[PDB]
Amino acid sequence: ATISFKNNCPYMVWPGTLTSDQKPQLSTTGFELASQASFQLDTPVPWNGRFWARTGCSTDASGKFVCATADCASGQVMCNGNGAIPPATLAEFNIPAGGGQDFYDVSLVDGFNLPMSVTPQGGTGDCKTASCPANVNAVCPSELQKKGSDGSVVACLSACVKFGTPQYCCTPPQNTPETCPPTNYSEIFHNACPDAYSYAYDDKRGTFTCNGGPNYAITFCP
Known part of the structure; x- marks a missing residue:
C-alpha cells in the first residue's frame, strides 16, 4: 500500500512509523509534517504495523529530539523501531499478500493524543473509514488526563495505561472478549469516537476491512 499522510491540524505534527515484531x-520511522503538508510512503506486501503522530517537539542543545505527546524516545526524529510512549492515538494495519483482506483501524487502546482517520483508496468491499475525529481531550476525566504546563489537557490515557490491570488491558485471566467486557472507561472513548477501537476487544474489531491491495490516506485532525 501507498500510505498518503495529510496534516489537517493547524499545528505541525511529527509522524512515527513502526513495523511490528x-x-x-x-x-x-519518523518525519516532520507541517500544517497542511502531505507525505507518501510505500509499505512492503505483506505488512503489519502502525503509525502515530507526535506534538510539542524540539531538539535540545545535545541533539536529543523530545516531544510532549506520543514521544518514541529514540532521541531522533526517526523512531528507529521504538513505539510511541502512551498516550498516543494509533493507526494500525495488517496487509496480506495477494489482494486478500486488509484489516486496519484507528485505536485508542494506548490512549489519545490527536484526532486521525484512515481512509481506503480503491479496494473492494465495505472499506469503511476508520476514525477518531473528536477532541477526546475535552471529555477526558481527571484521572486519565495528561496535562500541559499551563493546565490544559494535551492527551488522555487509556485505563489500561493508567491502571495496568487485566480488566482494562484484557491480559490473563481476562484475555478473551467475554472475560474482558467494556468498562466505564472504554465507553468514554467509544462515545467520543465510535469508529475507533475503544479498548482491546471493541466490538468493531475486524469490521474495518478492505480487499484488493487498497492505498490509504491517513489524515491528522480530519
Whole structure:
C-alpha cells in the first residue's frame, strides 16, 4: 500500500512509523509534517504495523529530539523501531499478500493524543473509514488526563495505561472478549469516537476491512 499522510491540524505534527515484531521497518520511522503538508510512503506486501503522530517537539542543545505527546524516545526524529510512549492515538494495519483482506483501524487502546482517520483508496468491499475525529481531550476525566504546563489537557490515557490491570488491558485471566467486557472507561472513548477501537476487544474489531491491495490516506485532525 501507498500510505498518503495529510496534516489537517493547524499545528505541525511529527509522524512515527513502526513495523511490528522486528520485521523490516519502513523507509522512514519518523518525519516532520507541517500544517497542511502531505507525505507518501510505500509499505512492503505483506505488512503489519502502525503509525502515530507526535506534538510539542524540539531538539535540545545535545541533539536529543523530545516531544510532549506520543514521544518514541529514540532521541531522533526517526523512531528507529521504538513505539510511541502512551498516550498516543494509533493507526494500525495488517496487509496480506495477494489482494486478500486488509484489516486496519484507528485505536485508542494506548490512549489519545490527536484526532486521525484512515481512509481506503480503491479496494473492494465495505472499506469503511476508520476514525477518531473528536477532541477526546475535552471529555477526558481527571484521572486519565495528561496535562500541559499551563493546565490544559494535551492527551488522555487509556485505563489500561493508567491502571495496568487485566480488566482494562484484557491480559490473563481476562484475555478473551467475554472475560474482558467494556468498562466505564472504554465507553468514554467509544462515545467520543465510535469508529475507533475503544479498548482491546471493541466490538468493531475486524469490521474495518478492505480487499484488493487498497492505498490509504491517513489524515491528522480530519
